[PDB]
From a paper:
For each two-antibody cocktail, there are in total six copies of Fabs bound to one S trimer, where three FC05 Fabs bind on the side of each NTD and three RBD-directing Fabs bind at the side (H014) or top of each RBD (HB27 and P17), shielding most of the regions of S1. Distinct from most structural studies of the apo SARS-CoV-2 S trimer in which multiple conformational states corresponding to 0–3 RBDs open were observed, only one conformational state was observed in the structures of S in complex with each two-antibody cocktail, which also differed from the structural insights gained from the SARS-CoV-2 S in complex with FC05 or H014 or P17 alone. Furthermore, each of the two-antibody cocktail limits the conformational transitions of RBD, suggesting an additional benefit conferred during the cooperative neutralization carried out by the cocktail antibodies via interfering with viral membrane fusion. Interestingly, three HB27 Fabs bind at the top of each RBD, either in the open or closed state, forming a “cap” layer at the trimer apex close to the pseudo-threefold axis. This “cap” layer together with an exterior layer formed by three FC05 molecules, fully occlude the receptor binding site. The antibodies also prevent access to the proteolysis sites, cutting off the proteolytic activation of S by cell surface proteases. FC05 recognizes an extremely variable patch on the NTD; none of the bound residues are conserved between SARS-CoV and SARS-CoV-2, explaining the virus-specific binding and neutralization activities of FC05. Footprint analysis of epitopes of these four NAbs suggests a partial overlap between H014 and HB27 epitopes, but no overlap between H014 and P17 or between HB27 and P17 epitopes. Superimposition of the structures of the complexes of S–HB27 and S–P17 shows steric clashes between HB27 and P17, suggesting that these two antibodies may not be able to bind the same RBD simultaneously. As expected, the binding of FC05 does not affect the attachment of any of the three RBD-specific NAbs to the SARS-CoV-2 S trimer, underlining the potential of these antibodies in formulating cooperative two-antibody cocktails as they bind simultaneously to distinct domains.
Residue numbers in the entry:
A (entry chain G), B (entry chain I): 2 to 119
C (entry chain B): 324 to 328, 332 to 526
D (entry chain A): 14 to 251, 256 to 323
E (entry chain J), F (entry chain F): 2 to 112
Write the structure that this text describes.
Amino acid sequence: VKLVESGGGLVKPGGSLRLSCAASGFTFTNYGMSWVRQAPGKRLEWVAEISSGGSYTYYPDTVTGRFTISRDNAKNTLYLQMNSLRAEDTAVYYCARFRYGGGGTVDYWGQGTLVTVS
Amino acid sequence: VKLVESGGGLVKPGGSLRLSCAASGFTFTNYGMSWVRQAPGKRLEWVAEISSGGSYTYYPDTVTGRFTISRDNAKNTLYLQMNSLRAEDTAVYYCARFRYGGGGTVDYWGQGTLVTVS
Amino acid sequence: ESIVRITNLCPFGEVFNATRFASVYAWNRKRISNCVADYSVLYNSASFSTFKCYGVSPTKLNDLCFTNVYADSFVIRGDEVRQIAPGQTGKIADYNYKLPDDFTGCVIAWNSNNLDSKVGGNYNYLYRLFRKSNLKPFERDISTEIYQAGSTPCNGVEGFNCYFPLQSYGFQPTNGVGYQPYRVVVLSFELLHAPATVCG
Amino acid sequence: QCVNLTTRTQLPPAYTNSFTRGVYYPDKVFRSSVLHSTQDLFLPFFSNVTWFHAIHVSGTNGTKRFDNPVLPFNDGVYFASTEKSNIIRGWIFGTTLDSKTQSLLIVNNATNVVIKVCEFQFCNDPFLGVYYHKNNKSWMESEFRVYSSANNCTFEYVSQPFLMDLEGKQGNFKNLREFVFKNIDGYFKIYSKHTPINLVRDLPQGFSALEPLVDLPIGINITRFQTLLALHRSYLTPSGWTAGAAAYYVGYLQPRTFLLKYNENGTITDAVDCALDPLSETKCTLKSFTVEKGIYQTSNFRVQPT
Amino acid sequence: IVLTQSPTLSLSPGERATLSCRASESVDNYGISFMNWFQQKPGQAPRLLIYAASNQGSGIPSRFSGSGSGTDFSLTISSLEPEDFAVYFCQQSKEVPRIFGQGTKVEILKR
Amino acid sequence: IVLTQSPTLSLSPGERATLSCRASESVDNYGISFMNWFQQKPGQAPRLLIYAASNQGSGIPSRFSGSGSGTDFSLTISSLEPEDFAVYFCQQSKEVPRIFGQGTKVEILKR
């Protein structure tokens, strides 16, 4: 349904920024979750991932994200702990909820996340 | 399993009508049953309600037209004497058969009965 | 005190630890005989996500001796695992795999999402979308003839109101737990009235 | 495969008399110098036993006679052979001798006998073919000259070879080899023995004790069978077949009550059938092999109705 | 009491058919399992679907599944068929002459 | 893989908006149904439009409809509205981290 995210905060580049994604309205187990950045002037770049059964933590080979996703099904909470922070990490990350097996699919997402490293 | 009922029956209006329903394939004595009428433009009305070990002889608040149910266990036949024949009395009078292991419920149903007065 | 006084090992390991498994539409049947069977270790480990026996107890199985043990292994989605039960109607029961109501068996399911699921999806696994008649219990059908849902004959070619009997399975990590594949093993026991090839 | 050479031959089955023979141990229980009595399937003494020949040269030149029939199992089966040079390997035991039933296929090898309980297709003239591989210079055994199909198989097992040679003896042993086959209660059990014999063909007066080899879950009724053979190929001479000569002994089992005399080491020597003669039935009453001078009352007789 | 159902569905094969059985006054059961589901083939004797909405089995194909929530009962048919749809019913129980459901029928397009 | 989209549209209400999702390398799916469509309201969380371009439903208004052809996916909005246009996306799947559309926005004149 909806997601509660970890909002705007600033770090210097080079650290590790934990995110958090709270699940409001659905069963957090049964849904692959993710974190996807929209930076300004950037197309959405699918970054962070988790499966619904075990841990997949899939990230794009491009430049390694080094993100540390976990799940707490008691919290229904997805995290994004982004290791090796950089200034480019400044973006709008979207922890997103995958739908049932299909063409994609991502029906519900977070409200958008302010994340700034500069 | 199989239910056979006295079909096409017409009597003078405001009178009474004996139905019948030969319970075939099983024991009428062991399996309680009831009478269900259907009126066009209306849902299945619950009329005569009888017990397996006894006679509940229950008529609904809606149509309390003396639904005298007879439990002929020797003939294995569910009988009915709907008094005050009327347009509401005209209906598809299928018999019934409460499931041996159901929360409510009716498992076997009479095929249907041509029943009318006009 | 009381004095009670392994060797042969029933080959459950091939059945429970294989990278790829026979599809539900066509499943290999394996007979386990002339070996010593211990089910206590399988239950104690609890490696499988769910250990289920409809009419038997897992601790009792190792003590009990079944002369013939039959293992049916296939990969199906978690929702399909719920459908597969003796005495329960299921979409799988109607088409690819049928369970006899009289027969009593142990169905053990463990998540295969980590290996079986692929981002592309695994088309090696396959299921029967439709069949003209319900399959006989403990039997499989390899027919590829188009199912004739329409009154007009399919004629062996795809057509409106004609649906291919077999549809390839699609398994992905982002799929839901019910959508995600679960490896399932069904056990059939000859039990008494037979020479005891297997002794507990 | 299913290459076949019936070569049917006439003449009556040459019979013989098993004097004291076919006494196995019908239990694992160790007993010492006692007289034990059970009524079980055996080959009763002084019995009629067919000295059959799988391959039989009757000399003019050559003339090898392949006679070995499919034989019913009946109640139980006894078997005996000498075969200084082995030509015999196993038996086809089954019912249909085909699919639709299981099949008991005993194959002896160079050297791992692979007992097989399966569903086969046995040919019209089954036997194990042997040839020369030319690769590693080894004589292989073509096993599908016996049976075409091997599938559905229910059971498989391997053990140390039951058939075994010693030789170097230029005869004087003949390595008389006996095998008893009894199918009961889901356990078809195999028995064996190896004995020297100096006689030309037939059996001596000695007792042969047969231990159970393996007690296996078989669960099939076997009503008929035939033996197996090992033959080979020859090359141009005025194809080659029927290596050496082959003959063996067969007799059928039967329920009988034997008194069993174990030794101090549990080696049964003297066994006595009770029903053999009116004299043998009294020794079963005293349980003793020594019968003291006197009169003893054996079981009663009745006249029976016409 | 008195119940209502979702009036109709118009759908296609291979789809889910969600049918409410909406009861006035009481909600389901104190034993927490009641109401029902029933189908009547058109011009034919009614037939059971599910009793207490959670339940049954053989004679009721697997495409019938579901539950009920308070008053509301979910008659849920995944994978619709143009052959298999007919007016659907539920029952109240535990109060009043048990009575019956909206009747409800799921149409199927692609015809 | 990598995809492209039709860059933009500048249009008027009551019109069709045809948006290509043009994928490099692979074309759609071996199961013949893949890619996607997505919309991001400006300064707002992205949102699904269509998955496998053929599909979805509620939450995605009827003005979103279309298909895709090989690599190309058609995001087709008939009857445009000046309220309803926002940057549109698609996704690849089945290869690579599934990425997304480079984004596309349909302007509307008559303002």
